[PDB]
Scaffold this active site. Structure first.
Site, PDB file in Angstrom:
ATOM      1  N   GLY A   1     -40.395 139.491 -17.324  1.00 17.86           N
ATOM      2  CA  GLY A   1     -41.648 138.562 -17.302  1.00 17.86           C
ATOM      3  C   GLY A   1     -41.989 138.177 -15.896  1.00 17.86           C
ATOM      4  O   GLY A   1     -43.203 137.891 -15.460  1.00 17.86           O
TER       5      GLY A   1
ATOM      6  N   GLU B   1     -35.041 145.432 -19.630  1.00 17.01           N
ATOM      7  CA  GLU B   1     -35.200 145.415 -20.942  1.00 17.01           C
ATOM      8  C   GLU B   1     -34.413 146.410 -21.752  1.00 17.01           C
ATOM      9  O   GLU B   1     -34.092 145.859 -22.799  1.00 17.01           O
ATOM     10  CB  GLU B   1     -36.501 145.319 -20.999  1.00 17.01           C
ATOM     11  CG  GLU B   1     -37.460 144.047 -20.691  1.00 17.01           C
ATOM     12  CD  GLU B   1     -37.801 143.997 -19.351  1.00 17.01           C
ATOM     13  OE1 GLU B   1     -37.425 144.982 -18.401  1.00 17.01           O
ATOM     14  OE2 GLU B   1     -38.390 143.025 -18.954  1.00 17.01           O
TER      15      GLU B   1
HETATM   16  O1  QUE Z   1     -36.134 138.408 -20.388  1.00 17.10           O
HETATM   17  C1  QUE Z   1     -34.823 138.132 -19.765  1.00 17.10           C
HETATM   18  C2  QUE Z   1     -34.688 136.697 -19.610  1.00 17.10           C
HETATM   19  O2  QUE Z   1     -35.640 135.919 -19.463  1.00 17.10           O
HETATM   20  C3  QUE Z   1     -33.051 136.460 -18.828  1.00 17.10           C
HETATM   21  C4  QUE Z   1     -32.637 135.003 -18.477  1.00 17.10           C
HETATM   22  C5  QUE Z   1     -31.338 135.000 -18.167  1.00 17.10           C
HETATM   23  C6  QUE Z   1     -30.992 133.715 -17.975  1.00 17.10           C
HETATM   24  C7  QUE Z   1     -31.577 132.551 -17.747  1.00 17.10           C
HETATM   25  O3  QUE Z   1     -31.118 131.194 -17.505  1.00 17.10           O
HETATM   26  C8  QUE Z   1     -33.205 132.770 -18.362  1.00 17.10           C
HETATM   27  O4  QUE Z   1     -33.793 131.632 -18.428  1.00 17.10           O
HETATM   28  C9  QUE Z   1     -33.507 134.063 -18.345  1.00 17.10           C
HETATM   29  O5  QUE Z   1     -32.054 137.391 -18.776  1.00 17.10           O
HETATM   30  C10 QUE Z   1     -32.616 138.688 -19.030  1.00 17.10           C
HETATM   31  C11 QUE Z   1     -31.707 139.768 -19.143  1.00 17.10           C
HETATM   32  C12 QUE Z   1     -31.809 140.994 -19.560  1.00 17.10           C
HETATM   33  O6  QUE Z   1     -30.645 142.100 -19.155  1.00 17.10           O
HETATM   34  C13 QUE Z   1     -32.851 141.400 -20.040  1.00 17.10           C
HETATM   35  C14 QUE Z   1     -34.085 140.488 -20.181  1.00 17.10           C
HETATM   36  O7  QUE Z   1     -35.012 141.106 -20.596  1.00 17.10           O
HETATM   37  C15 QUE Z   1     -33.895 139.220 -19.671  1.00 17.10           C
END
Ligand code: QUE
Length: 362
Positions: A115, A138
Site C-alpha cells: 500500500g 504480497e
Molecule cells: O501489507 C503489509 C503490511 O501492512 C505490513 C506491516 C508490517 C509491520 C507493521 O508494523 C505494519 O504496520 C505493517 O507487512 C507486510 C509484510 C508482507 O510480507 C506483506 C504485506 O502485504 C505486508
C-alpha cells in the site's frame, strides 16, 4: 494537545502536506486515513492556492509499510468486515494519486512497501533516499501486488516487475531509483532542505518543481555511480520471467541454474501457490490495461482472496506469529487450477469498482 490523528493534513505556503502518522505501526494505511486523504487530495486539486501536494511519513524509519492488512484479516474473523470498503476506497485513492491534477511529490524515505507503494509510485514524482526499502511482498502473505501493481509492475523495464511481483525481492536506496520506482534520489541528510525548498516555492509550475528535484538529485552522493543491483541479472530475469505459467517460470529458473536463479527459485517455492498464479495473470492482463482497468481487476482479486485460505494464514505467519512458516492450501501449484484462478478474476457486476457514477457508463 488532543490525541494525534493517524494522518496529518496541512497547508504550508503553496503546498498541501500529507504526513502518514502511525510510526509505531510503520505508517500502515487504514480506512480512517484513506477517508481523510482522499477528499483532501480532491480539494487541493481544485484549490487555486495549492500548487503542490507532498506525501511523507512520520518518524524516519517508514514512509508506509503497507495497507493495514492485519486489521482487515481480524475483521474477516467475524461479521463486521472491512475488506469490501477498504480495498475499494484504497484503490480509488491509488487512482486519485495516479491521475492527480496538481504536482504530487512522494518523499519515500524509509520502508515503502505494498500500500505504501500505491500511495507513491503512481504520482508524478517519487524521491528515494539511501534508507528507502521497496518491496511488493504480497505473494508471501497470500495476497497479490495490488494498489495498481498490475499497472506499474509490467511497465518497469523488461520483466523486472514480474520478478519483483512474484518473489517480493527488496530494493534498497539508489536501487529503487535505478529500478524506475523512484524518479529522483536525495541523500537523507539533505531531505529536510529539499522539503523546505519545495514548501518555500511561490506559485510553482510542475517545471519549477522538477527543477528543484533535479538540482538535489544531481548533487546527491550516496551510491552515485553504483550500478543497479539487478543489472547483471536482467537478461536471465527477462528470459525466465517471460513464461505464461508459474510452473514454466520455476522450470526456467532451474534450467538457468545460476546461484541467483536457484536462490530465487527457493524463494518462489515458499510463496503461496495461489498468490503466484494470480499475480502472473494479473500482471499479464495489466500490461494491456489502463490504471483504472487494472484497479477494477484488483478489486475483484482482493474480494476473492478474502474467501480463500492463504490470506489469513499468511497474515498469521508473517505479521502475527512472525514464524515465517505459512502452511498454504493448496500447497502445490498443480492444485491451483485454471477454474480456481478464473474465479478470482470474475466480474462483481454492480459491486465492481468503477470510477464515475453509473450514468457515465453504457
Ligand atoms: O501489507 C503489509 C503490511 O501492512 C505490513 C506491516 C508490517 C509491520 C507493521 O508494523 C505494519 O504496520 C505493517 O507487512 C507486510 C509484510 C508482507 O510480507 C506483506 C504485506 O502485504 C505486508
Amino acid at each position: 494537545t488532543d490525541a494525534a490523528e493517524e494522518v496529518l493534513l496541512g497547508k504550508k505556503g503553496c503546498t498541501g502536506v500529507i504526513t502518514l502518522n502511525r510510526p509505531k505501526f510503520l505508517n500502515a494505511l487504514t480506512l480512517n486515513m484513506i477517508r481523510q486523504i482522499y477528499p483532501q487530495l480532491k480539494k487541493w486539486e481544485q484549490d487555486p492556492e495549492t500548487f503542490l501536494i507532498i506525501i511523507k511519513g512520520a518518524g524516519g524509519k517508514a514512509f508506509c509499510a503497507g495497507g493495514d492488512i492485519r486489521v482487515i484479516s481480524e475483521a474477516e474473523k467475524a461479521k463486521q468486515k472491512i475488506a469490501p470498503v477498504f480495498f475499494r476506497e484504497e484503490y480509488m485513492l491509488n487512482n486519485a494519486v495516479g491521475s492527480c491534477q496538481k504536482p504530487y511529490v512522494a518523499l519515500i524515505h524509509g520502508i515503502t512497501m505494498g500500500g505504501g507503494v500505491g500511495l507513491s509510485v503512481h504520482g508524478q514524482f517519487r524521491v528515494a533516499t539511501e534508507k528507502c526499502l521497496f518491496a511488493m511482498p504480497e505473494t508471501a502473505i497470500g495476497l497479490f501486488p495490488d494498489v495498481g501493481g498490475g499497472y506499474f509492475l509490467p511497465r518497469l523495464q523488461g520483466k523486472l516487475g514480474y520478478f519483483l511481483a512474484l518473489t517480493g525481492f527488496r530494493l534498497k536506496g539508489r536501487d529503487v531509483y535505478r529500478a524506475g520506482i523512484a524518479t529522483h534520489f536525495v541523500d537523507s541528510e539533505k531531505l529536510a532542505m529539499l522539503e523546505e525548498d519545495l514548501l518555500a516555492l511561490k506559485s510553482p509550475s510542475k517545471e519549477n518543481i522538477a527543477s528543484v528535484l533535479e538540482n538535489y538529485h544531481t548533487e546527491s552522493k550516496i551510491d552515485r555511480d553504483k550500478s543497479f543491483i539487478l543489472e547483471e541479472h536482467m537478461d536471465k530475469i527477462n528470459s525466465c520471467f517471460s513464461a505464461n505459467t508459474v510452473e514454466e517460470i520455476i522450470e526456467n529458473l532451474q534450467q538457468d541454474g545460476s546461484s541467483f536463479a536457484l536462490e530465487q527459485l527457493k524463494v518462489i517455492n515458499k510463496m503461496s501457490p495461489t498468490s503466484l498464479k494470480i499475480t502472473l495473470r494479473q500482471l499479464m492482463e495489466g500490461s494491456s490495461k489502463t490504471l483504472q482497468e487494472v484497479l477494477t481487476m484488483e478489486y475483484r482479486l482482493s474480494q476473492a482472496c478474502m474467501r480463500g485460505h492463504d490470506f489469513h494464514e499468511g497474515v498469521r505467519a508473517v505479521l502475527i506469529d512472525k514464524d515465517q512458516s505459512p502452511k498454504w492450501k493448496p500447497a502445490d501449484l498443480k492444485e491451483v487450477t485454471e477454474e480456481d484462478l478464473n474465479n478470482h478474476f470474475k466480474s462483481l457486476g454492480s459491486s465492481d469498482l468503477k470510477f464515475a457514477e453509473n450514468l457515465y457508463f453504457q
